[PDB]
Ligand SMILES: [Zn+2]
């Protein structure tokens with residue numbers, strides 16, 4: 162996720178950047194959370210949304226307080242929280258395909274029926290309909306048709322299409 | 325303790341004059357020898373010979389003594405009444421005969437009066453409180469100690485229950501002061517005192533405390549207690565003729581099988597002792613010990629063990645207090661974690677629960693819910709000002725700097 166999460170700013174479609182960035186929470190062991198939460202707060206600011214940025218800044222500042230025992234992320238957190246309204250925007254925009262419950266776009270499981278969803282390999286959104294789901298036969302991953310039609314190769318394995 | 329020959333002596337003495345007190349001497353020594361039938365039959369006779377209002381002191385003991393071995397676990401309340409029936413009487417019948425000391429000590433019978441402290445302590449807890457029967461155990465000892473402060477035998481039981489006090493600084497000085505002046509008794513309180521210091525965080529002296537018990541004799545190792553406590557800072561348990569005392573022995577076994585990394589032996593003694601000690605009122609600790617191992621064996625079997633305890637157990641919420649801990653770093657659960665902490669918050673409400681459920685909301689990084697749970701922790705107790713500090717720290721960590729000012733001003737009011 163990290164590569165396209167960082168280059169999504171170059172791709173200028175900053176909406177999918179947060180969807181990518183909120184997928185590495187479970188991957189804090191492989192990549193240190195101080196690396197990812199910076200990007201999470203950055204893309205939260207760039208789309209002018211909040212709430213998740215508050216959690217990211219809180220974890221970052223707890224890490225800083227663990228470190229010192231002069232930090233600028235406290236300055237950034239306080240400056241943004243006082244110069245802007247720190248309230249979470251709309252985050253439930255996808256319903257569960259099984260029980261109809263609206264869940265987070267970055268949710269790995271349903272909040273109601275607890276059913277895992279396969280996530281898109283490039284946009285990061287959880288797939289709800291298998292009709293618009295493209296399954297890779299080599300790296301065994303799934304993505305969305307509307308984005309995978311643009312890419313002639315898989316983002317993971319870059320498997321050529323047989324013809 | 326010339327029990328067998330003096331048993332006939334009482335039978336002679338009971339025949340010389342039939343009196344309740346020397347008859348209860350016969351019952352006492354028959355209990356040591358094993359004739360519970362003759363011990364039970366004459367308990368009935370002395371119950372009928374009971375003085376109607378001033379109930380006899382040693383009569384309630386022979387009630388408590390006989391029943392303790394078998395019925396005492398089921399009569400953990402009822403024998404405690406028979407404990408109380410003479411414990412207050414010895415407080416009172418001696419007070420009825422005060423003034424001249426000769427009446428005081430003849431109705432004292434300190435070996436009986438000290439046996440009350442022996443009976444009380446095994447009925448009471450072995451663990452210090454968090455950051456009444458224990459006090460009831462603690463009140464009668466200071467009653468025993470105040471009149472004759474010199475005796476170390478009453479001191480050691482008193483110095484023991486000072487572990488329950490929670491005045492750790494005033495305790496460990498008193499634990500140290502009495503043990504250094506009086507050298508004859510067993511030093512195992514020195515280890516226990518230093519382990520309270522390590523429990524606070526004071527570990528530097530605890531390494532040397534191990535040698536201090538070791539200094540007197542190798543005979544301590546006849547108790548396997550020391551060898552574990554030796555390893556803490558850095559045959560016997562089966563017990564045939566070759567219960568809370570065995571519960572402390574089971575704590576020894578639990579930490580031993582924790583350190584040794586034996587899986588089969590640990591599970592085998594878990595099953596065996598749980599089979600033998602299922603009727604005890606402590607097996608919840610046992611099973612969560614199982615759970616603290618069952619996390620490395622099977623999560624769902626651990627959850628079933630956690631469900632094998634009812635709300636009547638004091639460790640049960642402690643069980644759930646660690647069942648929630650099962651979702652800390654191993655299950656990594658969110659919805660189930662919130663569910664469990666809500667269940668234990670509603671089951672036994674308290675400010676601390678309202679604190680740790682707030683901790684649960686800090687585990688999932690929900691600011692507003694953490695604010696609310698800490699706010700009702702503040703609301704539940706005026707004794708939560710030390711927790712209100714944590715409430716303030718969580719809300720400033722929850723970015724609510726607009727209302728942080730108002731919470732702080734109102735808390736300062
Ligand atoms: Zn669902």
Ligand SMILES: [Zn+2]
Nearest residue numbers: 297300315318
């Ligand atoms: Zn692929």
